[PDB]
Amino acid sequence: VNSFSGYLKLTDNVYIKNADIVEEAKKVKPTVVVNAANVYLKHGGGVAGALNKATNNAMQVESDDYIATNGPLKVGGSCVLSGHNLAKHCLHVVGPNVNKGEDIQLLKSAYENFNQHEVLLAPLLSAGIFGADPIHSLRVCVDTVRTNVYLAVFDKNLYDKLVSSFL
Numbered sequence: 001v002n003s004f005s006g007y008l009k010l011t012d013n014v015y016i017k018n019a020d021i022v023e024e025a026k027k028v029k030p031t032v033v034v035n036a037a038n039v040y041l042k043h044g045g046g047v048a049g050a051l052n053k054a055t056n057n058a059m060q061v062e063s064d065d066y067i068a069t070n071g072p073l074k075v076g077g078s079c080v081l082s083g084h085n086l087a088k089h090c091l092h093v094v095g096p097n098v099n100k101g102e103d104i105q106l107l108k109s110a111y112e113n114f115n116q117h118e119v120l121l122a123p124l125l126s127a128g129i130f131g132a133d134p135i136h137s138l139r140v141c142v143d144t145v146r147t148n149v150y151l152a153v154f155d156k157n158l159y160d161k162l163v164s165s166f167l
């Protein structure tokens with residue numbers, strides 16, 4: 001039993017809700033919140049910009065030190081950093097950005113990072129401003145993640161489309 005509330009159950013392990021991931025994180029304080037990161041951990045817009053803003057830029061400060069030490073992530077890769085005031089940890093995961101020409105096959109690799117954590121609050125990887133088809137992202141999530149994932153879909157209209165089209 002966990003403290004996530006109001007989610008629709010899609011499979012044994014995948015749950016979904018129309019919600020602002022920032023507000024959800026502040027309410028639940030999950031062990032892991034997933035960020036829709038880029039390889040530079042430059043948290044400018046979309047989920048990343050919103051999460052970072054909610055940390056008063058502390059996420060960006062921590063991220064800049066991470067990059068200065070370790071260099072960029074790989075597309076499909078991840079790193080674990082602090083969750084600041086939002087969660088215990090933030091798993092920064094880089095899905096492919098179609099608006100940059102990146103290979104959509106890397107979306108499965110990106111979701112594999114979730115399997116290193118028993119429970120996560122997450123967005124749909126490569127959706128929104130990353131330019132992939134969200135119906136596809138949800139399918140890859142369900143077919144790749146085996147741990148317990150609570151998906152927050154910001155756009156209510158998109159949430160309804162995702163539910164009504166889910167196979």
Ligand SMILES: CC[C@@H](Nc1ncnc2[nH]ccc12)[C@H](C)O
Pocket residue numbers: 019020021022036046047050123124125126127128129134152153154155158
């Ligand atoms: C990744 C695509 C989704 N983006 C988000 N999902 C959940 N919480 C969010 N907070 C700020 C953006 C955002 C879109 C609504 O389908």
Ligand SMILES: [Cl-]
Pocket residue numbers: 045046047127128129130
């Ligand atoms: Cl987005």
